[PDB]
Every structure is written in structure tokens, then in C-alpha cells.
């Protein structure tokens, strides 16, 4: 039975590959070769936020593009007011091995988790005035690698035990569980409609999941190594991915195949983060070689570089308004370029 | 816009309070020593932590030696693929690697050697030092003193190896026991001395699961590490 099932699976995979190849009528670069190049864009750092004792592992911009949140391994989660650089809150974490953070769209809660296998939801608007642990979600069996808010009462979490989960914060129990991956899940990205999402899990495959139906829909297998960062395209019909092979890729949800790849011969370091711009024309990617690159999403030519950091770049993020782009790095600083 | 100035003053006051708290926290955080305990499950690391103490994904143990604070982290309830979360421990002072010497027949000693090599040559862990505990010495002595388990069967080079001249055997050991012990130690040192960078070193130790000096050893080792780094900065070493 095992041999027969394996052979049938191989035949089905061959059928899938043939079907995908049938649609490859033309390449994106050939079609986009006529549009005008962006040229050269030199962004400059307008701020520098200091106060972290150790390196920085995560950050999430606010919905209003004025506050932001950062997490570090000194057991500290700090909320900055970007415009003036004055700190608003410094929550201390129970566990110092924090690997992710998130900021709710309503601005009333903050989430954080890590090696302790738990996701903590903190309240920022208690009447007493002190930040208190609102909830603790403790149903996973591996380190939490990414988490995002759907609303003030639903949170989607990704862990290293190869299964994602959708949690109802009020009850504290997994409303749904998503399974099908083989390796650790690393990244995550909610769709603009909050109806789907994607995830890349360290086996060179990114799966597209349906939140309400609770099951996988499509899989993309273009990469060669672990996938560290994933982002949804503004329109909602494509997504960009980055892995340890030092190459970024753009997949399309409808055509169901890779569209283009961004890479260069002189770059041999893995990508740690990826994010689009408001228009979707630019693609910013943070690397391990201490500087982050800015690619033209249609021409695939290196358009710009940001080189203000001196250590690994671990987190990157564009605002909702497209005003600026923030980056954190293992040197314990946060820079805001614009 | 007097309200703007009022809220700006309140913001400045909040910033000052947070800055004071962070200064205190930095003071406390700079004077605490973090250690990562690692080793195979079959090894005696469990008894080691139990002696030092006298569903979560990580366990913490805090102890004091001569009014110095050590925090030891033990990783449990995690899967067996270490290539991702290990990177979170690239700031610890030392990695206490516990390996059971009387493990050779699966062949566990070779697996321990491969794990040690992988940790040693990692990109983010090239500045960290390893304190190597060759635990379970009594079992090895009993096994080698009279038995049919030949180290030569699994390690042919053992047939051509003689004890180093600068060997300090414990009074009472048969020459074969010392020969086996030092063969294993040198096997572990071959990997450690190959890199040649000089940024980190290894500190081998012969320990039993019930030894009461282990704590002290860690303490002493820690000091050496620091000293050496300072002596490297001032061009003295």
C-alpha cells in the first residue's frame, strides 16, 4: 500500500506540475520590460530610538502610523511614540526569550510569546493605569514564532510544532487548528480581507490557509531552503517570500505559480524580513549582512540600500500610511527611514 | 495649543520615569551570568540540575556563588530540530555540555561528538565557550576494567593511543581506566583546538553525577573566560 500510495502521489504531483506549466504563457519580466524604472531612491534616517539593553527581535507598527511596539531579549516590551521618540510604556516580560510581538488594530492590546510555548495578551488601557496580563494562551507544544490579531477577540498564532492555531482570546481555547506542514512554521501574514493567510514552514513550501473553513487550499514550492519571512501584496492576489538561500520570490495566488525572483551573485546571506510599500511597487528586504535592500517589484533591479545598522537586521516594517519604514537590528536600536 | 504643551510635559515626565527604571534594570542585568545547560537526555544532566537546585518550553534555575548570581536555562518540551531556537542563546556566558562517557555500544558517543562539532562551528555561536562535563565516570571505569566492550571496536585509533605525559590520574586508578578517560577527552579536544580563531576555548572536566564540586567548577571556569577576553583586548594574550 505504501509503495502504491507514494507512486500515486508522485503521479498527482506530476499532473499538478503539468497543469501549472500549461498556464506559463509568458514571463512577468518580459511584460514589464517596458514600464519606466524607478531609478535611484536614497532614504535617510529621520530618527533613532534608544533604550533597549540587548538586541531586538520584533516590532509592529501601529494602525495610525504614530506608535510602535518592540520586543527584546532583556525581558522588555517597549512602546515608542515615533514622532517625538518619547517612550509611553515599558512592559516587563515573565520570560526573557521573546521572539515576536503584535499590535492590535484597536490599539488596546499587545501580544508576545516565545520559547516558553505561551502567548500573552497585555492590556494597555486598564482603568487603574497599569499594564496587566489580560490573557495567557498555553495550548502549543513548540516555540511561538509569529502571531497576529484578527480583531479584539481573535488571534492567529504560529508555532514550531508544525501547526498553526486560531484562538478565541475570551475563552482561551483553540477555536481552530491548521495542520499539514512538515517543519517548523516561521512566518505568517493575514490577508487584507482577514479571510485567508499564508505561512512558510522551514521545508521550502508556503501554504495558503482559509480561516473560516479551517483547511489548506494551495501550496507553493519554489524555494530551496528554510523560509524566514512572508508578506501579502497590497492588492491581495500575490505574496512575496524570503528564505535562507539569499533569494526572494513573488508568488501569485490565482495563476498558482511563481512569477519572479530577486537575487544577485554577490549576496550570500539569508533574508530575515520582507515587506511591501503602500503602492506595492517596492520590496524591502532585510539581510544578515547588516544592510537592507530595496528592490523594484516589477523590474527586479536593486534600486536602493539602507546601511545604517552594524549588526543583524531582524525586523522591518512599513506603515499603513506609507510615510516611513522602520527597522530593528541586533545592535539594540530602532531606525525610522524616510 | 496649551493642551499640546501640557501633554508634551506629561510625555516628558513619563519618559523620565521609564528612563530611570531602565537604568536600574540595566544595572541589575549587567551583573547576572547566564548559562545554557545542554546534553543528551540519557545523560545525567537531570541529576546534575537536581543537585544544583538543592508543559513549559524552558526551565530556569537560579543560584548564588560567593554573592554572584547565576541563571541556568535547560531546554525541555521542544522538538529535536535545534537549528532554529539554538540561535536564541548566542549571548550566554557558557554552554554546559554534559556527555556520558560510558556510552559507546546506537553509538551515542559519536552522536555527542557530532552535536559538539555542530555547536562549535555555528555562525552565531563562534564567541561562546563550552564547559564539557564527561559525566558517568564510574560506569566507564567498571565497564573497561573487566568486560567485553572494546573501545577499539568503535574507535580503531584507540589501539594506537598512549596516555599523554602530562596526565594527572586520580590515585587508585588502573592504567587502562586513565587511558580510556584521556582518549575520550582528547577526542573531544581535537574538535575544539582545530578552529584556531582564539575567540573561545573549551574547559574539560571529569565529573560524576553525585560530585558536589560541580558548582564550584562552573564558577571557576566562568572567571577564566572573562579574564581571557580582557587579556585579549589589552593585547596581553
Amino acid at each position, epitope marked *: 500500500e505504501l509503495d502504491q500510495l*507514494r507512486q500515486e502521489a508522485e503521479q498527482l504531483k506530476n499532473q499538478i506540475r503539468d497543469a501549472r506549466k500549461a498556464c506559463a504563457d509568458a514571463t512577468l519580466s518580459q511584460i514589464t520590460n517596458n514600464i519606466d524604472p524607478v531609478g535611484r531612491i536614497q532614504m535617510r534616517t529621520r530618527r533613532t530610538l534608544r533604550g533597549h539593553l540587548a538586541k531586538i527581535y520584533a516590532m509592529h507598527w501601529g494602525t495610525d502610523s504614530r506608535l510602535l511596539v518592540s520586543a527584546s531579549q532583556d525581558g522588555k516590551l517597549i512602546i515608542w511614540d515615533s514622532y517625538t521618540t518619547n517612550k509611553v510604556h515599558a512592559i516587563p516580560l515573565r520570560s526573557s526569550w521573546v521572539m515576536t510581538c503584535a499590535y492590535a488594530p484597536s490599539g488596546n492590546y499587545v501580544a508576545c510569546g516565545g520559547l516558553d510555548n505561551i502567548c500573552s495578551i497585555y492590556n494597555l488601557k486598564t482603568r487603574e493605569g497599569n499594564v496587566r496580563v489580560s490573557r495567557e494562551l498555553a495550548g502549543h507544544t513548540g516555540y511561538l514564532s509569529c502571531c497576529r490579531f484578527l480583531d479584539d477577540n481573535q488571534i492567529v498564532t504560529s508555532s514550531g510544532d508544525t501547526t498553526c492555531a486560531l484562538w478565541d482570546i475570551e475563552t482561551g481555547q483553540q477555536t481552530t487548528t491548521f495542520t499539514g506542514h*512538515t*517543519g517548523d512554521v516561521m512566518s505568517l501574514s493575514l490577508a487584507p480581507d482577514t479571510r485567508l493567510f499564508v505561512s512558510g514552514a*522551514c*521545508d*521550502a*513550501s508556503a501554504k495558503l490557509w482559509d480561516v473560516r473553513e479551517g483547511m489548506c487550499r494551495q501550496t507553493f*514550492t519554489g524555494h*530551496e*531552503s*528554510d523560509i524566514n519571512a512572508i508578506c501579502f501584496f497590497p492588492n491581495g492576489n500575490a505574496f512575496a517570500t524570503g528564505s*535562507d*538561500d539569499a533569494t526572494c520570490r513573488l508568488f501569485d495566488l490565482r495563476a498558482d505559480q511563481e512569477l519572479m525572483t530577486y537575487s544577485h551573485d554577490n549576496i*550570500i546571506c*539569508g533574508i530575515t524580513s520582507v515587506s511591501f510599500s503602500k503602492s506595492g511597487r517596492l520590496l524591502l528586504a532585510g539581510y544578515d549582512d547588516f544592510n537592507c535592500n530595496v528592490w523594484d517589484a516589477l523590474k527586479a533591479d536593486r534600486a536602493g540600500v539602507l546601511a545604517g545598522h552594524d549588526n543583524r537586521v531582524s525586523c522591518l516594517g512599513v506603515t499603513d500610511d506609507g510615510m516611513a519604514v522602520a527597522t530593528g537590528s541586533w545592535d539594540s536600536f530602532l531606525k525610522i527611514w524616510n | 495649543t496649551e493642551d499640546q504643551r501640557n501633554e508634551e510635559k506629561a510625555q516628558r515626565e513619563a519618559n523620565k520615569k521609564i528612563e530611570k527604571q531602565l537604568q536600574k534594570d540595566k544595572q541589575v542585568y549587567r551583573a547576572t551570568h547566564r548559562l545554557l545547560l545542554l546534553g543528551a537526555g540519557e545523560s545525567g544532566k537531570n541529576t546534575i540540575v537536581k543537585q544544583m537546585r538543592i508543559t513549559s518550553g524552558i526551565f530556569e534555575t537560579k543560584f548564588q556563588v560567593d554573592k554572584v548570581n547565576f541563571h541556568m536555562f535547560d531546554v525541555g518540551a521542544q*522538538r*529535536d*530540530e*535545534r*537549528r532554529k531556537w539554538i540561535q536564541c542563546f548566542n549571548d550566554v556566558t557558557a554552554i554546559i555540555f554534559v556527555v556520558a562517557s560510558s556510552s559507546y555500544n*546506537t*553509538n551515542r558517543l*559519536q*552522536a555527542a561528538l*557530532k552535536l559538539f562539532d*555542530s555547536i562549535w*562551528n*555555528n*555562525k552565531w555561536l563562534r564567541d561562546t565557550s563550552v564547559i564539557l562535563f564527561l559525566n558517568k565516570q564510574d560506569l566507564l571505569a567498571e565497564k573497561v576494567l573487566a568486560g567485553k566492550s572494546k573501545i577499539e*571496536d*568503535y*574507535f*580503531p*585509533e584507540f589501539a594506537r593511543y598512549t596516555t599523554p605525559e602530562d596526565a594527572t590520574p586520580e590515585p587508585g586508578e588502573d592504567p587502562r581506566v586513565t587511558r580510556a578517560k584521556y582518549f575520550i577527552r582528547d577526542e573531544f579536544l581535537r574538535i575544539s583546538t582545530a578552529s584556531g580563531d582564539g575567540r573561545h576555548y573549551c574547559y574539560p572536566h571529569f565529573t560524576c553525577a553525585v560530585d558536589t564540586e560541580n558548582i564550584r567548577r562552573v564558577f571557576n571556569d566562568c572567571r577564566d573566560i572573562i579574564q581571557r577576553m580582557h587579556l585579549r583586548q589589552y593585547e596581553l594574550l
Partner: nanobody
Amino acid sequence: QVQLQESGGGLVQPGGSLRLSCAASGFTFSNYKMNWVRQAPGKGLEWVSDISQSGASISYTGSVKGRFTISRDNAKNTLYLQMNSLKPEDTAVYYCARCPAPFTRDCFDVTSTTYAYRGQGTQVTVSS
């Protein structure tokens, strides 16, 4: 998609010789260190040997030293393990594994759980 396929195996009488081959596709072959591991019945995975990108550095396990040999052909992206003077304890399933990331010499590719970058394997049995 990373694809690894093992070939060569079967039944051999003690004292014979055998050759195992591993074909790889879906990634740049020349940039990854590779190795051969094995699993015997009732036992977990064991590490058999490894070879670097260009073949300069080669390593074997103690029990195998002086018997097997590992080579890699980057022109056609293949890996070869030549074994001779077999013994009954060599009966096992052999797997062709690859290190996770390129341009590095660290490796974590023996994990008992599903490792995403190893092939299905080939069965080799040595008996009278």
C-alpha cells in the same frame, strides 16, 4: 522542489561489495555539504559519513573507517557510496541527507522526526 532519490541495494552475501547512488534535483547541488546516514531495524538514525562541497573534507564513522568511501559528482549532481567487506550488522536502510543551509559547515540532519531534506532511502541486507 527539493527531490532526493536513492538507488542501489538489495541482498548481498557477507564479504561482498555494493554501491549506493543518490540523485538530487531542485537546488544548486554544488553549494551544499552532503552526507549518508542509515537506520537499522529497532534502532534510530545513525550517521555514516559526510562530504563537503568540493570533496576536500571527508569524514566517516569509526565502525566504517577503512571500508566505505564517499564521493560526489557536481557535473551531474550525484552522490556515491562504495561499500565493501560487508558484515551482518550493516543490514539497514540508507538515506542521502543534505545540510539545511548553503555556504556553511554546520549540520543538524539526523533528527528522528521528519527531516524535510532527505530522500526515501534504499534497503540493503547482508546475510547468508
